[PDB]
């Protein structure tokens, strides 16, 4: 049975009144430090701090110079030299921006994606390795220290339509991607080819050479299945050695490549089988671009629906049916919940909506 109970302690609506697509707490902040999160919507990036008695303190606002930009995602990192926090944002333009959260200044940007960017994820061990997933059918790996495009994941056996999500595993040995082509693809980045490609990107010096850096083109995934969902796959995350993915079917499917007893690291690229282990059911989440989330220790799973309900499950409960905690509803929360974020310690859950509203749920 589920233990976790929450209480809605505060809400706010942003001035632009545009949909909020993404939210992320900064999990790099040191124990004790004020709990900060960023929200993205329209051509805005906004920072907030969480104080006692459900107080949400506005810190800084970033308004993009391009009025037509529509941010879809953000991800936090830190500079590996200065220990300074960094925030990457992207959207409709297909331009990645590295923002200094303290000054709200665009430090650097990366062009190259031929279409919109749906997701940005930083490597769990390397703060410089940023992955971007795009409408151009590809995923790209960047080294934001050397400003290089390390690799492009797509081509011959890559995605055949817009890529919607991706996730690194806990240790960052492999990435799982998914898109509109209904497929879920595995790309190992711990292969000798990729580990060397990563090293090469660190050795690259533009003031010591005239030739630009040569990115790797990964045309072939290490695993591919179109047998989990019957439609578009808009969200994917690793749950240990298992996968969690959703479509429009009002369920988060928990599965693994190959047969039940197959090892994730011994799965051959040609693997034709796939094992479905369970399902996390909900309702009113048939619209596109609705992401689920997990807390750091991967104990809680959260997903918002199109009507303002926040479903929460206890991932320590073996059966996904007796794992569902009390749904987090507030009679005033009625618009689509696009994304949720747990604070590092899982004491706070923030939810963002289509009506520019933020919702703070504090654990009991």
């Amino acid at each position: 049975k589920c233990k976790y109970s929450f209480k809605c302690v505060n809400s706010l609506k942003e001035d632009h009144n545009q949909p909020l697509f993404g939210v992320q707490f900064n999990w790099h902040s040191k124990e004790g430090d004020p709990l900060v999160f960023a929200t993205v919507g329209s051509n805005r990036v906004t920072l907030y701090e969480c104080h006692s008695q459900g107080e949400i303190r506005l810190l800084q606002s970033y308004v993009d110079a391009d009025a037509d930009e529509n941010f879809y995602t953000c991800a936090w990192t830190y500079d590996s030299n200065t220990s300074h926090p960094l925030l990457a944002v992207a959207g409709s333009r297909g331009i990645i921006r590295i923002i200094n959260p303290i000054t709200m200044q665009c430090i650097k940007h990366y062009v190259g994606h031929g279409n919109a960017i749906n997701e940005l994820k930083f490597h769990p061990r390397d703060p410089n390795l940023l992955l971007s997933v795009s409408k151009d059918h590809a995923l790209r790996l960047w080294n934001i220290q050397t400003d290089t495009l390390v690799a492009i994941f797509g081509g011959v056996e890559g995605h055949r339509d817009e890529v919607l999500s991706a996730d690194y595993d806990l240790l960052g040995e492999k990435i799982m991607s998914c898109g509109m082509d209904h497929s879920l693809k595995l790309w190992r980045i711990n292969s000798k080819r990729m580990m060397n490609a990563i090293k090469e990107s660190y050795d690259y010096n533009p003031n010591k050479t005239n030739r630009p850096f040569i990115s790797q083109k990964i045309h072939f995934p290490d695993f591919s299945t179109r047998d989990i969902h019957r439609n578009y796959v808009d969200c994917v995350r690793w749950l240990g050695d298992l996968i969690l993915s959703k479509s429009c079917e009002n369920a988060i499917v928990c599965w693994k490549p190959g047969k039940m007893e197959d090892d994730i690291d011994k799965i051959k690229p040609s693997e034709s089988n796939v094992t479905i282990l369970g399902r996390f059911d909900y309702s009113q989440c048939d619209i596109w671009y609705m992401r689920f989330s997990m807390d750091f220790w991967q104990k809680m799973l959260a997903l918002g629906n199109q009507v303002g309900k926040l479903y929460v499950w206890d991932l320590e409960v073996e059966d996904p049916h007796k794992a569902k905690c009390t749904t987090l509803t507030h009679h005033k929360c009625g618009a689509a919940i696009r994304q949720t974020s747990f604070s590092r310690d899982s004491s706070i859950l923030i939810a963002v909506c289509d009506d520019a509203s933020i919702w703070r749920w504090d654990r009991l």
Partner: peptide, 29 residues
């Protein structure tokens, strides 16, 4: 079971990331 086995994998791997986080002192924002 597969569940309990997957659960320990998460425990150990999140513990490796948590230790690396503890050894870090990221400046406030």
């Amino acid at each position: 079971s597969m569940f309990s086995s997957n659960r320990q994998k998460i425990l150990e791997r999140t513990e490796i990331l948590n230790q690396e986080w503890k050894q870090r002192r990221i400046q406030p924002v």
